[PDB]
């Protein structure tokens, strides 16, 4: 196992794109959602759990999600990268960038959640709920899926995360939302939401490309259906916005590009440019539909939670349509039928969106007996 | 033909860097030269128009614009990328990259139409416009310089873009400001224009250097001759500035810059850094007194038309001069004259005017008989 | 010597990301942090002084910092990079790439100073300053440290520019601040200075990971210990702030973003992942203590310039401890004790300490017998 300079370059740049979706991608996006009033503490609390995460994840998340250990969890022979050998490779990059690149995933995974939350909920409540929720949640959701554990054993397809980031985010969200958040705001700054929305979107590319490991014919598949869905999902929301609405929306057209990013993440690198036109088009229309009727049983910004929920479950199962060869993708594993692959998507979602809810419920209700969750 | 992974990484994160130009550097560049009251709906119309052109590119674009043909146009071969091979290598990168990379370059090139006429058109008749301009216009062109066409085949030089994009778009833009747009505003948001500006730089490095299609001794020269026609440029900028106005300003050092980076756009991959700073200065300067003038026969931003056209023939004509080996350029092409470059710079420069204008005007008119051109 | 591809695209992008350091990342971090009537004056020198380092580094700078001479400084044999041919290969990459990273170092360190001075000095005089200091500070620092000087030559460790870039700018900056400077305002725009902060810290990984000069094991070293310092500094500074005034501050955390950034800089490249966080937690601390001292003896923003100065002389100082075997970092040199690193180091801090304040006492006094420092 040699390390190739050209992976360990491409991965490296990767990671620093992921990281910028959430310093400041989600921080920018989440800031023109919210009061005025409420923004330099939401931008904090995305700061320093953003710090939060970083060094949990190199004392013993990293060793957690990836190492070997059983079904569910790694193991602790990680701690802090002991044992692991600056030479060490893992694919065909150096082990060290793999911990960086997996790392800045599970930095966005809690941005998404800390952003819309943060104005609800006391600042040292925010910090027992990430060590809760990342350490039993995240961890073994990326366990499962990327670190050989249940999921990957059994064939799951998620090229990005649309179950470890996607979904798992949005579930932890609608929890808190469900327990805190104000009951009935018209955004204050959308210059700074579309800013917000362009970083995520630019960066998307580390992390949607980024995850083939390697600079080959994967990432730049994966590279192109990003570019596609993000387009036709853009194109998707606004003809809906148009058609129901009158006219399209700026707001509109932003949440119609997460919908085509969140609906291509677990699929980008499986399908084909049809298969990501397609899967764009209606993540747009089913974030849209999502959204509309999350706000019909909703005064905080869920908008990311009902995009990311909704687009991250249609991405998941369309995945397990489009990776079939006759559909241009490269093909399911040797002996799979669409229909056993297609079971085991919704099976993974299934898995995801119960072990994420039970988590978050336990991290509030934690954070809440022990400092009070709810701002004083 | 191999595909070269650190070709291929390079070429990524180019097409990523080309991308943020658009999303969100044009928009934020123009967000702050527009009245408040009409920024949202521009960046809603830079959004949709950028979504419209990365699946046009597509469906058909890059077949049309990229697939062999005659002179003018390619083939209807490539469509929705069929019968392109997953590990088709085009050059030294796979060719699904080439598709990205060339398609990116296509929407800066919208958006920078787009952004400033927003304001004055009906959000239908943009993507009528946008529709006939990028298929009868733009895909032409790039066929005609960089895809085996007319100008291509007379050994027409033009690294990255001067005609292509540059020339291209000014023209388009400039037909636009003469048809339609509020004849008599001072700049609301300079930070905003100053960090459209700035990513529009940083952008601008994979534009540039990523047009030399590997990460070699070329794309490191473009690289250099970039950073060195930008600072020449606003040096230039600034000091005509303080010449004639007495002082320099934030709106000029930004577009000094822009004049930097257009006029040194066809030229980069070809010359010396010292043509690059003779390039930036005499670019500068003359975006300076372009500005002027165009203002002397113009309430709608055009500055960027008029730093674009006048900076983008500076710097095609330029290119003619200083590819030249006697003054530190690459060199002209075997048994070619400074003379006869010159001449097919200048026929370069005419038939992209000529035909974007053309093209530009059957666009609005389009529109106009189909939807109504000014906005209701 | 051959050039490889793989650490020319590395090489050429981290470049992109050290001068989206400065633009727009300086420029938007000191643009939140002055009154409103001086943010497009100060935006405007920003602009025009780094295009001014752009064109003398160009010139001369990389002649006389990284040529062959004495201990002091180089040569001029590489005037306008004159003798230089295109495939001169540096170390792994073209030298040409290795100009413009060397470059875009000079670029960051200059806008550090001129962003908290810009507000109190003259136009023309900021133009003469940095002419001066360029010249016979930051070139022979760079000469001495990287070019194969005096520190280099006696072992100095400053792996990405603890003295060249931060202690070398925050003694000139606070020369300025003593001489000029408004004698005793709360910052004006938060959010701009987050984002400027998190525009910083991406940048930083090309400025911290592409100082190894290659996409190897130390590249990703360098990289890992880039986000553990950062976020073990954002922890350590944030935890003070509680302790001391009761609850953290966006300040706050995006000033222990940079003291971790700054302490990490000159140990990156030859730490362990224990000694970075170990670090990164003092260098919060010691920045927090830092800026709350100066404060106490300062009406201009020099958060930068106590964050830069202190964390920079802590960074270089346990760069002399933490670089040891036993500690997990790479190993000093053969022959050499920790005790005999450790003097090394504050030989080298002493030295840019002195240097640095006497070329700025030089450059400022020039300007103002020249055109007058303190603006009109």
């Known amino acids: 196992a040699v390390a190739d300079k050209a992976d360990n370059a491409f991965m490296m740049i990767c990671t620093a794109l992921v990281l910028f979706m959430t310093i400041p991608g989600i921080a920018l996006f989440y800031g023109g959602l919210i009061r005025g009033k409420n923004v330099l503490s939401m931008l904090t609390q995305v700061t320093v759990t953003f710090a939060l995460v970083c060094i949990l994840w190199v004392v013993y998340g990293y060793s957690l999600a990836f190492g070997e250990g059983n079904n569910f969890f790694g193991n602790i022979n990680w701690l802090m990268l002991k044992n692991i050998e600056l030479t060490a490779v893992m694919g065909s990059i150096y082990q060290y960038i793999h911990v960086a690149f997996q790392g800045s995933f599970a930095c966005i995974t809690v941005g998404l959640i800390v952003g819309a939350l943060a104005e609800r909920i006391r600042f040292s409540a925010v910090l027992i709920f990430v060590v809760v929720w990342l350490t039993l949640s995240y961890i073994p959701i990326a366990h499962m899926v990327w670190g050989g554990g249940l999921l990957a054993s059994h064939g799951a397809l998620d090229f990005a995360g649309g179950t470890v980031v996607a979904i798992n985010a949005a579930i932890a969200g609608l929890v808190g939302a469900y327990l805190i958040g104000k009951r009935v705001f018209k955004p204050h700054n959308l210059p700074m939401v579309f800013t917000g929305t362009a970083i995520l979107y630019i960066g998307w590319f580390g992390f949607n490309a980024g995850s083939a490991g390697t600079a080959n014919e994967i990432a730049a598949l994966a590279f192109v259906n990003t570019v596609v869905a993000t387009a036709a999902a853009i194109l998707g929301w606004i003809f809906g916005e148009w058609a129901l609405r009158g006219k399209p929306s700026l707001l509109g057209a932003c949440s119609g590009a997460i919908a085509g990013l969140v609906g291509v993440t677990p699929a980008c690198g499986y399908?084909?440019?049809?298969?990501?036109?397609?899967?764009?088009?209606?993540?747009?229309?089913?974030?849209?539909?999502?959204?509309?009727?999350?706000?019909?049983?909703?005064?905080?910004?869920?908008?990311?939670?009902?995009?990311?929920?909704?687009?991250?479950?249609?991405?998941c199962i369309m995945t397990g349509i489009f990776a079939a060869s006759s559909l241009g993708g490269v093909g399911f594993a040797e002996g799979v039928t669409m229909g056993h692959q297609l079971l085991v998507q919704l099976e993974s979602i299934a898995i995801t969106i119960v072990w994420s809810g039970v988590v978050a419920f336990i991290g509030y209700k934690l954070a809440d007996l022990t400092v009070g969750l709810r701002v004083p």
């Open 271 to 315: 399908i084909g440019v049809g298969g990501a036109l397609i899967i764009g088009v209606v993540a747009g229309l089913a974030g849209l539909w999502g959204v509309t009727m999350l706000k019909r049983l909703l005064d905080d910004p869920c908008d990311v939670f009902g995009v990311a929920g909704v687009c991250g479950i249609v991405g």
